[PDB]
Design a protein around this motif. Structure first.
Motif, PDB file in Angstrom:
ATOM      1  N   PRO A 322       0.804  -1.227   0.000  1.00  0.00           N
ATOM      2  CA  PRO A 322       0.000   0.000   0.000  1.00  0.00           C
ATOM      3  C   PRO A 322       0.840   1.281   0.000  1.00  0.00           C
ATOM      4  O   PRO A 322       0.415   2.277  -0.583  1.00  0.00           O
ATOM      5  CB  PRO A 322      -0.838  -0.113   1.286  1.00  0.00           C
ATOM      6  CG  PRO A 322      -0.084  -1.055   2.151  1.00  0.00           C
ATOM      7  CD  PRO A 322       0.585  -2.026   1.219  1.00  0.00           C
ATOM      8  N   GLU A 323       2.026   1.235   0.612  1.00  0.00           N
ATOM      9  CA  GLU A 323       2.918   2.402   0.697  1.00  0.00           C
ATOM     10  C   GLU A 323       3.511   2.835  -0.641  1.00  0.00           C
ATOM     11  O   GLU A 323       3.568   4.030  -0.950  1.00  0.00           O
ATOM     12  CB  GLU A 323       4.064   2.133   1.690  1.00  0.00           C
ATOM     13  CG  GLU A 323       4.962   3.374   1.972  1.00  0.00           C
ATOM     14  CD  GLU A 323       4.335   4.369   2.956  1.00  0.00           C
ATOM     15  OE1 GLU A 323       3.538   3.941   3.829  1.00  0.00           O
ATOM     16  OE2 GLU A 323       4.647   5.583   2.863  1.00  0.00           O
ATOM     17  N   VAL A 324       3.972   1.864  -1.422  1.00  0.00           N
ATOM     18  CA  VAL A 324       4.711   2.141  -2.644  1.00  0.00           C
ATOM     19  C   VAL A 324       3.840   1.945  -3.895  1.00  0.00           C
ATOM     20  O   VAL A 324       3.922   2.731  -4.843  1.00  0.00           O
ATOM     21  CB  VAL A 324       5.995   1.266  -2.715  1.00  0.00           C
ATOM     22  CG1 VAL A 324       6.726   1.455  -4.026  1.00  0.00           C
ATOM     23  CG2 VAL A 324       6.913   1.536  -1.495  1.00  0.00           C
ATOM     24  N   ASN A 326       0.511   1.937  -3.818  1.00  0.00           N
ATOM     25  CA  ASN A 326      -0.674   2.778  -3.642  1.00  0.00           C
ATOM     26  C   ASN A 326      -1.967   2.027  -3.954  1.00  0.00           C
ATOM     27  O   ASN A 326      -2.828   2.517  -4.663  1.00  0.00           O
ATOM     28  CB  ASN A 326      -0.554   4.074  -4.487  1.00  0.00           C
ATOM     29  CG  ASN A 326       0.711   4.882  -4.148  1.00  0.00           C
ATOM     30  OD1 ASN A 326       1.203   5.677  -4.951  1.00  0.00           O
ATOM     31  ND2 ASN A 326       1.247   4.649  -2.972  1.00  0.00           N
TER      32      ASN A 326
END
Ligand SMILES: CCCCCCCCCCCCc1cn(-c2nc(N)c3ncn([C@@H]4O[C@H](COS(=O)(=O)NC(=O)c5ccccc5O)[C@@H](O)[C@H]4O)c3n2)nn1
Ligand SMILES: [Ca+2]
Ligand SMILES: [Ca+2]
Ligand SMILES: [Ca+2]
Length: 433
Positions: A322-324, A326
């Protein structure tokens, strides 16, 4: 006359799965039939510059089915198919399901040795391949089949030579004469899955059981008519085909978007071009994407859900999704033999990042057992044993091996070491023989 042999569920289990509405006794072609009724002109497959609608997919697979039926290929017969990640894979798959021909889809990565073993086991009257594949680049492999009396009656080739029967020609141009055909019965074999790595073993799958796994997976993953799923893993693989895979997306009226492989730059441009909102990867491919994703943020924004399955996927990597990338993460622990586990879309962050989820069905039965096959204390590591409405009851024509991987209650032993988490999900920790 004689249908492919396989190990049946007990009649008590079969009735239960019908009573629960899991087995609806429809052929896998249901997916296509219903789509054509409801939304004939929606896109079903995007492949390169091609756009195949539901009705086009239906027409083309019908075309091919009629040509095979015309040549006497039908119920009781088998086929070997080896195609890359192109629309023709699904046209062919649905054609053989329509015709009642039981198909083994080899991975495009399989070579002479595996294909020979496959042919020996199923004795196919039909072989579909590609002239661009190393095995069919010359005629050495094909000629070898005469020598062992295993030559198929019909060979079709993608990227065909002038002497070959052209796969595209058999798809495009209808039969001269009408011969009746239909799918194999719904509680009989539709096709062979393959075990995940000796040569892969053949897993008979029925229409009932595979269609159930597909429909139920589609609901779990929240698929809908707006779903556009990247197919970057091998098309024939259980994960890419049914978990929820291409079949799941077609079940939900969405669109499959092909990629030849998970190479990130190419995948990213395809994701951007077609506004792909779902993808499915193995951890080694996730690493490739994570390495480039920051630089190509713009191209992949439309991704809403990434499934990761197939292999060890450590938490430190899971959190980066989810961080990279998205997008939401879903972990998937499945087997071609049956049982599939998903983290749910409304699972907690901890569940999503640290577990491999929980079974499709309330009737996926699980035992987690020690060396004496006794059920371990809650939360402890043990060997996974399972049976359910879409888990097989035996490999094809393998009574000795079946006696070794099934217990007397017909639970299948995958070799996976797992533990149940206090939250209810499973964690895969290893493998044992
Ligand atoms: C440092 C120390 C060394 C490290 C050692 C680590 C040991 C490994 C520990 C480990 C494994 N993990 C692990 N995690 C997963 N999420 C997972 N999913 C599948 N497997 C394995 O693939 C088989 C089935 O293969 S298949 O081709 O037929 N099917 C699919 O793969 C498939 C996948 C999705 C959906 C539908 C599908 O059909 C299963 O039986 C498992 O062995 C998996 N293994 N996570 N951690
Ligand atoms: Ca079209
Ligand atoms: Ca996104
Ligand atoms: Ca971010």
């Amino acid at each position: 006359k004689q249908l492919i042999e396989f190990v049946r569920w007990s009649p008590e289990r079969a009735q239960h799965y019908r009573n629960k509405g899991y087995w609806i006794d429809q052929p896998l072609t249901r997916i296509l039939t219903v789509g054509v009724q409801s939304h004939p002109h929606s896109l079903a497959i995007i492949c390169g510059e091609r756009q195949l609608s539901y009705i086009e997919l239906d027409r083309l697979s019908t075309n091919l089915a009629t040509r095979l039926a015309e040549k006497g290929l039908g119920k009781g017969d088998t086929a070997l198919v080896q195609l890359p990640n192109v629309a023709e894979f699904y046209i062919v798959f649905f054609a053989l399901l329509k015709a009642g021909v039981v198909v083994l889809n080899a991975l495009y990565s399989h070579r002479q040795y595996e294909l020979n073993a496959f042919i020996k086991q199923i004795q196919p009257k039909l072989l579909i391949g590609s002239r661009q594949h190393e095995v069919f680049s010359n005629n050495q492999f094909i000629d070898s089949l005469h020598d062992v009396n295993l030559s198929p009656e019909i060979i079709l080739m993608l990227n065909h030579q002038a002497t070959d029967f052209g796969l595209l020609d058999w798809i495009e141009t209808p039969a001269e004469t009408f011969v009746d055909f239909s799918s194999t019965p719904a509680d009989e074999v539709a096709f062979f899955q393959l075990s995940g790595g000796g040569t892969p073993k053949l897993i008979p799958r029925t229409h009932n059981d595979y269609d159930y796994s597909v429909r139920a997976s589609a609901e779990i993953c929240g698929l809908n008519s707006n779903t556009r799923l990247l197919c970057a893993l091998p098309a024939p693989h259980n994960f890419m085909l049914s978990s929820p895979g291409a079949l799941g997306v077609l079940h939900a009226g969405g669109c499959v978007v092909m990629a030849p492989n998970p190479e990130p730059l190419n995948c990213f441009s395809i994701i951007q071009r077609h506004q792909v909102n779902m993808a499915s990867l193995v951890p080694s491919a996730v690493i490739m994407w994570l390495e480039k994703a920051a630089q190509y943020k713009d191209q992949i924004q439309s991704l809403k859900l990434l499934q990761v399955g197939g292999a060890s996927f450590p938490e430190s990597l899971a959190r980066q999704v989810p961080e990279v990338l998205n997008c939401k993460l879903q972990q998937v622990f499945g087997m071609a033999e049956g049982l599939v586990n998903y983290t749910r879309l409304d699972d907690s962050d901890e569940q999503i990042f640290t577990t491999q989820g929980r079974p499709i069905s309330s009737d996926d039965e699980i035992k987690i057992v020690d060396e004496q096959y006794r059920e371990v204390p809650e939360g402890e590591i043990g060997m996974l044993a399972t049976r359910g409405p879409y888990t097989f009851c035996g490999y094809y024509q393998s009574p000795e091996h079946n006696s070794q991987v099934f217990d007397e209650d017909n639970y299948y032993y995958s070799g996976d070491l797992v533990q149940r988490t206090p939250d209810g999900n499973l964690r895969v920790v290893g493998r044992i023989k």
